[PDB]
Amino acid sequence: LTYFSARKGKRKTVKAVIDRFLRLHCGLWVRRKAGYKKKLWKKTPARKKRLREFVFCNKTQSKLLDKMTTSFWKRRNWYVDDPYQKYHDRTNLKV
Amino acid sequence: KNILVRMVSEAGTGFCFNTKRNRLREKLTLLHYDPVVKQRVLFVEKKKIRSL
């Protein structure tokens, strides 16, 4: 990535990550399963259900995605009707 | 020797499913579940999507 811009001298976001991932404020990243739109005719209903899921990422994956995005993408957003609003905060988490 | 075809329901319109069919056979008419009308209804083949 661009650590320092030529114009502003600022860290840049990788726009690929924004197109593919959602960041929850708590630090988790959400993604679609790969190949969920692909060749559904030859796939079992159980497998199709597994594919049609929003899944969280590894610690290592999360750390990668954090570095590849600026602080703007990590801010608390109060969207008017956000389907992922409840998932922004963690409850009853011990260590 | 098999082709993937689209099956469209007569009722609960706008719902369809894909099934494989022998190429040399006639057009399929099936009785399949429709979630829009929440019942089993008749489906007809409209066109062949691909050949597998």
């Binding site: 990788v14 197109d19 959400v30 993604r31 679609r32 190949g35 570095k67 957003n77 | -």
Partner: protein, 287 residues
Amino acid sequence: ARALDLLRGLPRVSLANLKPNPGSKKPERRPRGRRRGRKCGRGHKGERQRGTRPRLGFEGGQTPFYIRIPKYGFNEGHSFRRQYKPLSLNRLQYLIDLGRVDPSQPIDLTQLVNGRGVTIQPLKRDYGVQLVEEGADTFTAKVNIEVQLASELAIAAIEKNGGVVTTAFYDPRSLDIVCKPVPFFLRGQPIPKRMLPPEELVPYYTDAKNRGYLADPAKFPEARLELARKYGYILPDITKDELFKMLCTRKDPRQIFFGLAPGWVVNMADKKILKPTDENLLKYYTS
């Protein structure tokens, strides 16, 4: 203090005497000596050690994780999304109790911001304040409040105590102006008229249930009564209250401030208001 008594005996504090607080200043490490610098933390010779290690996200040739995942519109129109800062009834009560906001006067965005109860960022696409149901119980305050969004339960809580809640729209420009009036006054430009809600937001602000500012006032009584029936409280009669005039008072649409008409110039230095006289200007500002 005992420490000041200690100071009395000690030599005078000078620029010679000073030191940083322990733990504040970590030692700087530099590649000199047996330990810190021979390969200098860089390990054995390779791509990493030469300093030419490939970009973040590159997996050495394998299709990268971030690329492998399909695109989905999680952030499709994040910028064009409207955002509303939540103000709990709990927080509102706290502000009233601590005297940060004045319930005797109408409570607005300016009043909330001046009380520093809420922080509104006009940029970052905040469209104002959302009143939320949190702290509905143990809210005992009679207020005339104007918010951009209000939940059913929050409206019920306000009305139970004999208060009045209204729902208003502020466009980005007027929202900036209303939240920070003093900087705007220093800009020199006359007060603009607040633009009407976008087409999609019009039905919300014209609904009596939401307590919209553009809604029919004749529709308000039965709306209030139905809300009272639902949550099982006797609906207070506002007319009987001596603060009826205060509870009634609302800024009409196309008016940012309570006593200031659009088109007026505030001259703060000499403490005066300048009003246009030209027919064209008056027609423009009134419309």
